């Protein structure tokens, strides 16, 4: 999880399910950061993988989800931003005193 987040991810989640010692099967889930679950943006913003680890007592499933950071160009993450995020361009700066006196060379 720490490596995922220093790699730049917007959030991550690792769930480990199976025999965590004992007869019964436990499932732990460590989610750090932010991640969506619903809608279309999960297809291009959340990348997930499921693996099976064969131990001497049984099979342990590891499910890892990483929510990619928004990135225009470069293809490290997704191009289009989250559809609910509205970005505002800052209007041009205006710092003028009472009397317009400009600095010229």
């Amino acid at each position: 999880l720490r490596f995922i987040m220093e790699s730049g991810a917007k959030g991550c989640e690792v769930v480990v399910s199976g025999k965590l010692r004992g007869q019964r099967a436990k499932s732990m889930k460590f989610v750090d950061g932010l991640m969506i679950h619903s809608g279309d943006p999960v297809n291009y913003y959340v990348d997930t993988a499921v693996r099976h680890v064969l131990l001497r007592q049984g099979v342990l499933g590891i499910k890892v989800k990483i929510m990619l950071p928004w990135d225009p160009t470069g293809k490290i993450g997704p191009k289009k931003p989250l559809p609910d995020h509205v970005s505002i361009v800052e209007p041009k700066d205006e710092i003028l005193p009472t009397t317009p006196i400009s600095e010229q060379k």
């Binding site: 965590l20 436990k26 732990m28 131990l55 001497r56 007592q57």
Partner: protein
């Protein structure tokens, strides 16, 4: 095959209410201050 290992911490969190509550509590206490 092999078997995954357990920290005393997760052992206590899993067996805090079980037959092994006393043992996991003792091992966790030994971890935290056992010098």
């Amino acid at each position: 095959g092999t078997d995954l290992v357990t920290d005393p911490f997760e052992d206590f969190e899993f067996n805090c209410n079980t037959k092994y509550s006393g043992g996991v509590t003792r091992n966790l206490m030994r971890e935290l201050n056992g010098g």
